[PDB]
Design a protein around this ligand. Structure first.
Ligand SMILES: CNc1ccnc(Nc2ccc3cc(C)n(-c4cc(-c5c(C)ccn(C)c5=O)cnc4Cl)c3c2)n1
Ligand SMILES: [K+]
Length: 316
């Protein structure tokens, strides 16, 4: 009939129907169950001690009785640990977070006929580790407001919210299918994070056009913008540079293609270019990274670039 996994923190149990749902070509719900148990065991050393060793070695993913036995062994072990704590919320580790995001996606994007080499289906394979590097480089604080422009199903927002302490994390998506899927991703993320007893910052996944009037002031008041501008046309890029021109000093933009040349040299013929008000650096996880040789671009609002040019004109 069904398989149930009791929460290590006493939240509502995770309930899976039998036959288990089929996921994409290289994922199945039976492995998700086993890896969930394994992650909770890393999380609680007492749980690994109490749980019967063999259970996580000798199993049949295609057998209801075998999967039920595995779940029952884990559930009984959770009960023993909960009894031990009678007699007497942190951020997830990077590894647990990759598992949680995968789990959230699988429960949200059922039959992925809807929605490329960098698709939501493969987020965990290169984008996750790269976003983890961007998070470590940026070092956001409680004073920061974070926005992912074109958030898709919301994977980057969820990862940043689980990793940082920004006052708020926003994801804005214009397309109908991804935005609709983001609503389930949001529900599933909140539910699973509660199940593991893991903390995350506040976040909102919204449907909208980041080039709208409403979003002009919102971009101007964001301290950290993430934007996958890789496929942006010249008009989106031009409009986006105009939005960025209203940002505060020290405002940061992390993107897949630079918005200004890395070697921008202010002169009399380029005073209208975004390069006059922003520093740009190419960051690469390769410079102990073993993934794809991929770069990201960090832009920092700095109007002193423009101020020095005028100062140099007046005081040669
Ligand atoms: C990627 N998924 C999502 C989903 C929702 N939001 C974001 N936001 C976001 C914001 C800032 C950056 C900067 C980079 C480097 N990436 C980045 C780029 C690419 C990529 C490459 C290198 C080449 C071609 N294409 C088409 C690509 O997508 C792959 N993965 C990442 Cl993590 C970003 C992603 N990304
Ligand atoms: K044991």
């Amino acid at each position: 009939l069904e398989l149930r996994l009791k929460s290590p923190v006493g939240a509502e149990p995770a309930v899976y129907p039998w036959p288990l749902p089929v996921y994409d070509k290289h994922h199945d719900a039976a492995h998700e169950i086993i890896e969930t148990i394994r992650w909770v065991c890393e999380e609680i050393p007492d749980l690994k001690l109490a749980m019967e060793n063999y259970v996580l070695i000798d199993y049949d993913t295609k057998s209801f009785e075998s999967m039920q036995r595995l779940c029952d062994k884990y559930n009984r072990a959770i009960d023993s640990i909960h009894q031990l704590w009678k007699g007497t919320n942190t951020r997830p580790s990077t590894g647990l977070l990759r598992h949680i995001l995968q789990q959230v996606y699988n429960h949200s994007v059922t039959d992925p006929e809807k929605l490329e080499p960098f698709s939501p289906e493969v987020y965990g394979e290169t984008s996750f580790d790269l976003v983890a590097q961007m998070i470590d480089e940026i070092k956001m604080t409680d004073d920061d407001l974070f926005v992912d422009l074109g958030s898709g199903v919301g994977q980057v927002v969820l990862q940043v919210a689980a990793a940082t302490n920004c006052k708020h994390h926003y994801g804005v998506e214009k397309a109908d299918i991804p935005a609709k899927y983001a609503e389930t991703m949001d529900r599933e993320f909140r539910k699973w994070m509660k199940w593991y007893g893991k903390k995350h910052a506040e976040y909102t996944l919204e449907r909208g056009d980041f080039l709208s009037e409403e979003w002009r002031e919102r971009i101007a008041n964001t301290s950290v913008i993430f934007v996958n501008n890789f496929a942006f046309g010249p008009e989106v890029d031009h409009q986006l540079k105009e939005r960025f021109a209203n940002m505060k000093e020290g405002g940061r933009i992390v993107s897949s293609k630079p918005f200004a040349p890395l070697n921008f040299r202010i002169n009399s013929r380029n005073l209208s270019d975004i390069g006059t008000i922003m520093r740009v650096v190419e960051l690469s996880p390769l410079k102990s990274w073993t993934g794809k040789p991929v770069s990201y671009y960090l832009h920092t609002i700095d109007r002193t670039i423009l101020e020095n040019y005028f100062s140099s004109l007046k005081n040669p």
